[PDB]
Amino acid sequence: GCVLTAIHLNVTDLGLGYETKEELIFRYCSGSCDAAETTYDKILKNLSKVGQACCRPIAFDDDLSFLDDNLVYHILRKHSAKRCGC
Amino acid sequence: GCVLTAIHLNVTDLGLGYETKEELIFRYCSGSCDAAETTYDKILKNLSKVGQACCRPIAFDDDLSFLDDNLVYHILRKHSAKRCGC
Amino acid sequence: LYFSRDAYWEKLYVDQAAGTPLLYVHALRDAPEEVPSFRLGQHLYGTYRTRLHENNWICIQEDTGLLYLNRSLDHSSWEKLSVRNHGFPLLTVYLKVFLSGECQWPGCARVYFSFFNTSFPACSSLKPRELCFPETRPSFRIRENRPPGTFHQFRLLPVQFLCPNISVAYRLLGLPFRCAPDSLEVSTRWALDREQREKYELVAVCTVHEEVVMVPFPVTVYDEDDSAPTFPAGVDTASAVVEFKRKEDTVVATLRVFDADVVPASGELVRRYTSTLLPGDTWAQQTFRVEHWPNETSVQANGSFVRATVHDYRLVLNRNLSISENRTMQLAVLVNDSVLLLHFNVSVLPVSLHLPSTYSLSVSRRARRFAQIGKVCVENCQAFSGINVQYKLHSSCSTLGVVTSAEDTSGILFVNPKCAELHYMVVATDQQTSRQAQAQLLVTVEGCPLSCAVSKRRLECEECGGLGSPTGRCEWRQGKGITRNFSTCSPSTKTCPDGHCDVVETQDINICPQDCLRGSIVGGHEPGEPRGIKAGYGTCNCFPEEEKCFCEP
Amino acid sequence: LYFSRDAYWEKLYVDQAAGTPLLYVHALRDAPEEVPSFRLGQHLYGTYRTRLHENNWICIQEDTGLLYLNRSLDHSSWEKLSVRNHGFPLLTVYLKVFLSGECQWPGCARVYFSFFNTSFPACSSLKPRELCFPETRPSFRIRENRPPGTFHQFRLLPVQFLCPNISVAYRLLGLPFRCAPDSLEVSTRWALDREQREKYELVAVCTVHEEVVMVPFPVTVYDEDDSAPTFPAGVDTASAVVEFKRKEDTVVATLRVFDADVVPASGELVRRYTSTLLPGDTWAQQTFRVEHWPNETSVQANGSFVRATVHDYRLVLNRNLSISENRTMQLAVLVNDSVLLLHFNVSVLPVSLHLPSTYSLSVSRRARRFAQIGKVCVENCQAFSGINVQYKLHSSCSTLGVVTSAEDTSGILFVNPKCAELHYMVVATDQQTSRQAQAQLLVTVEGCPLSCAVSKRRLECEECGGLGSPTGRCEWRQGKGITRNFSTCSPSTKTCPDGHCDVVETQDINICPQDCLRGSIVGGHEPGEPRGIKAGYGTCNCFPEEEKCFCEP
Amino acid sequence: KGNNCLDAAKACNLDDICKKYRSAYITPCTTSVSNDVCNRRKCHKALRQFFDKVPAKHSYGMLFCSCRDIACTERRRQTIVPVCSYEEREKPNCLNLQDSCKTNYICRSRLADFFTNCQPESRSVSSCLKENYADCLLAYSGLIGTVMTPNYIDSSSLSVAPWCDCSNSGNDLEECLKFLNFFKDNTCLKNAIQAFGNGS
Amino acid sequence: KGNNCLDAAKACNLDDICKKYRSAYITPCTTSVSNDVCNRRKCHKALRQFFDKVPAKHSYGMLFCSCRDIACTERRRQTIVPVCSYEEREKPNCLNLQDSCKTNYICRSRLADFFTNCQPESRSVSSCLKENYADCLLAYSGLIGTVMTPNYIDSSSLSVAPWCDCSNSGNDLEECLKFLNFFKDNTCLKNAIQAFGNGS
Ligand SMILES: [Ca+2]
Ligand SMILES: [Ca+2]
Ligand SMILES: [Ca+2]
Ligand SMILES: [Ca+2]
Ligand SMILES: [Ca+2]
Ligand SMILES: [Ca+2]
Ligand SMILES: [Ca+2]
Ligand SMILES: [Ca+2]
């Protein structure tokens, strides 16, 4: 279902506008769930383009930070995950 | 966003196959969210027909149960909601 | 001395005279010596048995049991009482009549009075419907086999006492009931018995002046222990041979006894109908018992459906017998009724433990753990009930394994390097007797999720195997709404999607969950009565590590 | 008596003779009476100052300060020591030279020796580059204004002691430095002063046999307190009038003093350059102080860039002065240097509290609470610094309200039934002096989320109003990457999306959050240095009840 | 058109308190356990807490919905599930059911109430007092959930009965019927049912 | 092609422990507070815990990435943020910086280590012992994060310096330069930098 997957990326590939080239190792949660799992969702499917369950994290990791070109450090809190859930 | 809405229905309109006509008051969660709300979802939108956030509940209510025609009671657990979230 | 009825009805009005007769009473006789004495009560009991005031207005004749006013009735008396009436509308007070606390038959009979706001109405305002009998009908109650006598008198005493100029006549319709002319006492000629007839709803004929009136007349006839136990037309004793079951309890032999009474009712039936076991060997007290429960039935005897009891006696086992018992006895039973003789030929035969020795079977080597292959069965398969025949597998390469299922005491064998023929000397033991046997197996060998229930589609079940497979793969069963024919990718197509949860399926909680999970299925379901599915909607697939299944199309 | 240098270098070899001279030493004179005595140390100190063994091989002449071997050097001695060398390669040991602990100039001078595995090399294996001077160059250190003398001697003593058949000559290049013929002592004729020249990097000329060699020769000249404080060409005393600020501290007047020395360095500058405040009224000690910090500069005096100190003296306020002070004094300062006279004309003038009395303004009646409309200003707007001029609003209908902002001490007025003209007698008070004033306001009146920052688009901000609106609606400001020009639906287009968080914006936490929230913005951001935004990517909208904003395109 | 019973069900289940304690009396009555069909004890406990806590106009509607066709009378009898809660394998004798109620506290409370309340005496107007109807009502519907459970038999009328008969009675038979038809043919209780089913 | 510094950054940030305590020395150095530009004290504390906990081959790579073009030498100087952590408004005198290090425990540890380690004595082979390089390394990079912070000045060479000069010195000037150029022109430390930047 909602499972863990590590990846390599650039902070330029985060694309927040920070002027650097430095990188990171990023761990995300992917894969859909069972799409009903209670009576209430069955009745939501009966009543209705907004809909069923999602994949999210259940906690967050420690920080990720770096230097840009222009003389300045940049910080990131709440950016990548450890454990995944519906 | 994902908000609360009460409704009147029949248990026949639940359509689980129970042989009755008795009813209920059902409270659901409707309305989509802000569709990005993190860098990770921006990069998911960059990479990709499966997609962005949903509307779900955050808890469940107390039980809902009844009688059918044929001499038999029927129970329901986990069927309707109190509070709604992305 | 008992009362022919229980409750008496008569009406009062304002300013009636003293000495104005109300009613006669009647008391029957169980013996000719029985002289009915009569006396009154004291307090006018009101609605919801409220004592109201000392009755000083009324006297009685013991000799006839005649009620008559000594004092007269007036609005000072009837508003003195209607305040005590607790704010309720007044139309009923009553008294007690003892003849030799709470008033009941046969010691007592309560007599009512229904007062009205008006006084005594005139003779022309009285319709002939209410000149013959009062409205609330009597209920006559006679015991059988008594000194026969008189139980009823006709005349409305205020009516003829204050309107005597109307000629009023009363009579009755091979019946012992007769009405005398010139004296309106109702009598019975000879004594009744229930065992011939038991219901007499006759008609009393009234004649006014002109109108003739017909009224009901119910008589209930009682019963006695004038009967001893009796066989049902030449059936004295049955017998059978204790053969196969040997459970802790099983009904063996059954006899019927006809006592023609009803009278020892279902409460004091413990005290009289005792199944006295006549002794013998004390081993029968270890191993047998006599159960006795009645049921009462009706029969035509002289045109009425007279009822009585049927007393059945049963021999039920008392313990789980061993195999090797070979004995015989004759067990006698005395029967009380307040005394018949019964017996039973009871013989115990032992059972041979001869398992079929030579039998062979082929096993696909691709099979997974807990794989159902073959049935080991003793010579009497569907017949043992209280014997623990346990299967031991001595071997002479570990692939197979047997545990006896406690249902059939039969063996469903399971899976617990160039070795494609083996030798399993199957040893068939017992626990309560050390007697075992053994037999020869000549087993011939012929060369994705964890469980099967996680599967969802047809080819998803057929192209992939689970944990308990004797074939390597699982098997899809496929069959209205909330019904026992549901569908699942089940392992054991005669044992998994089945309705029984055996010891093949319950060792580790992955094998066959539809019949053996303890979760909570979401869906249009109906819970399996041990556990699991009794019914489920659409498709039903399971995720057992979360201990949960789902029914959803 | 001080040493012309600090560290001395000479080489040793195996089996050199006793009485073999190593080096002369030199010690300068601060007085002509100063007789340099010389004695040696005791332990051969090794690498990382490790005592190795008692030096018994070497004696000295105090009179010339000549080092020479009393005993000879052999492999029994140099493997006795190289084990004590802690497993490190041996090329450097040293001693101490006291002249009248840790060895330092001018009490001591440490002398090195660089031993080699070979013995003394022959005369033809010595290139004329290493016959003149050793490799590690000397560093000559002379104090100015001394009895001038001799500080250096040329001859390599093992070279001529064991290869005397090579004619070797040494000389030097209006300089007091001279080299005598037939005696190779280097002398200085007259005494030096730093204040004329301070750097002498000359060249000593060596002649072998044929090769002539040129070498460096650095001399550092020191300094004294031969100088008293001095004015910078006719600048004695400044003055100013204490006018507007009246902060706790502000520099008022500034003077420059030139003492031509360097010698009282930055450590003991507290002990000598004391700003002695000459007394007067004690009110100046309540209200003023004299700060003194140096900075050292260089100047051309006779072709070199001779450096000295610059001593500035400043008058800085000591407390928040009141308004009504009207006085004058002449504050004198004595200056020490180990003594100059300074003063300051200091006059305090009071400030009038004449607010402009008659002023009118129009207010749209649709405006919301905390609505910025107009500026109240005292007669000297951008000029007060340490005076708490607080605004009180006496009225004679509650729509408007004023609180003084503590930045400008100016009034930004806010919103806290057929009444469309009012009268607000604006009362301008102070806290430290009871002096107030008052003035006349003739205010003329002319007939969706909670905050503005929750808005997201252009017309979404322009077609809907928030909490702090003077116009009823909000206002969209719209302006690269992580930059201070960001965009928001801000209330106060000169005060909300601004960079300052005033008391207009901070009463209840809904008004202008971009400059005043305390949250944590997600996005390419750069935090506002008090709080809030300094920069944010794309579009930035806020949700203040969760105390959070977002920057996202 | 439906009937009065489904509309009374709409009346109960729309209030969430009636619905929640409805599920309270539902749950142990229909989870079948090993070698039973339900638990009788928990089910009856939960019916008693339903007919004590939740107020009148929801429950007495569904219990006393006036009927005009036959499936109404079915559901009229259905009101407490005979199959788990009222029926058993056997009917005992009615005095046995009376003393087994007499070994129960709350049962004897409801039975003394019913002796008190729906009594058909001499000639008042509708065989009752017409304002002790509710006490009549809180008698019968009071009797629900203890061991003496009344329920309908005659779908075509309003004659209720418990789970016994006057078999095996002997001498007390008529007294049995004096008890038994007291549930079966009461003019006062039938007037109360008709009055509550007309809309009183 | 990049340079050695971005690849050494790839070397550090791929290990998550180097990255986590990287963010530890990042965070208080660049959240600007009211009337400062950062906190110097928390920032230097966090640099010290970074250069104590995380092992060698990540950090000394980025700090000692050998340079061939000018933005490399920029980032070479950039290694500890002068603007918040090394630069201030003023340079004091170097003996003042020495005694202010002498009022600091860990600083004096690193300074006595650097006195011990990268010493350019008489003629060994590469002005060092070549296997006390790491002790040379754990001297200089040891000195990071206390009040005596060395950093680069000459981008075109390897001459490092702290935040002082020999102004206001008077008599101790040359001794000052004896100290000062000890950071600036060390043959042993420059041989160690070249050796670590060739891949030792
Ligand atoms: Ca008889
Ligand atoms: Ca008899
Ligand atoms: Ca008998
Ligand atoms: Ca099964
Ligand atoms: Ca001088
Ligand atoms: Ca001087
Ligand atoms: Ca001086
Ligand atoms: Ca602002």
Residue numbers in the entry:
A (entry chain B), B (entry chain A): 117 to 164, 173 to 210
C (entry chain E), D (entry chain F): 29 to 128, 135 to 207, 211 to 246, 251 to 379, 388 to 445, 449 to 468, 476 to 506, 515 to 546, ...
E (entry chain C), F (entry chain D): 150 to 349
Give the authors' words.
Signaling through RET plays essential regulatory roles in the development of the nervous system and kidney. Glia cell line-derived growth factor (GDNF), Neurturin (NRTN), Artemin (ARTN) and Persephin are four ligands that induce dimerization of RET through assembling 2:2:2 ternary complexes with RET and the co-receptors GDNF receptor-α family proteins (GFRα1–4). Here, we report the cryo-EM structures of four extracellular 2:2:2 ligand/co-receptor/RET complexes, including GDF15/GFRAL/RET, GDNF/GFRα1/RET, NRTN/GFRα2/RET and ARTN/GFRα3/RET, at near-atomic resolution. The structures show that the extracellular region of RET adopts a ‘C-clamp’ shape, which is stabilized by extensive inter-domain interactions as well as binding of calcium ion at multiple sites.
The reconstruction of the GDNF/GFRα1/RET complex reached lower resolution (4.4 Å) due to preferred orientation of particles. The structure of the intact RET extracellular region in complex with GDNF and GFRα1 has been determined at low resolution by negative-stain electron microscopy (EM), showing an overall batwing-like shape in which the two wing-shaped RET molecules are tethered together by the dimeric GDNF/GFRα1 complex in the middle, and suggesting that the CRD is important for the dimerization and activation of RET. All four complexes show the same batwing-like architecture as shown in the previously reported negative-stain EM structure of the GDNF/GRFα1/RET, with the dimeric ligands located at the center connecting the two wings formed together by RET and the co-receptors. The segments in GFRα1, GFRα2 and GFRα3 corresponding to the helix-loop-helix-loop motif in GFRAL are much shorter and adopt extended loop conformations. As a result, interfaces I in GFRα1/RET, GFRα2/RET and GFRα3/RET are much smaller (buried surface areas less than 700 Å2) and likely weaker than that in GFRAL/RET (buried surface area ~ 1500 Å2). Interfaces II of GFRα1, GFRα2 and GFRα3 with RET (buried surface areas ~ 730–1010 Å2) however are more extensive than that in GFRAL/RET (buried surface areas ~ 680 Å2), which may partially compensate for their weaker interfaces I. The D1 domain of the co-receptors is invisible in the 3D reconstructions of GDF15/GFRAL/RET, GDNF/GFRα1/RET, and ARTN/GFRα3/RET, suggesting that it is not involved in the binding to either RET or the ligands in these three complexes. However, there are large differences in the angle between the two wings of the batwing-shaped complexes, which mainly originate from the different conformations of the ligand dimers and their different interfaces with the co-receptors. This angle in the GDF15/GFRAL/RET complex (~60°) is much more acute than that in the complexes of GDNF/GFRα1/RET (130°), NRTN/GFRα2/RET (105°) and ARTN/GFRα3/RET (108°).
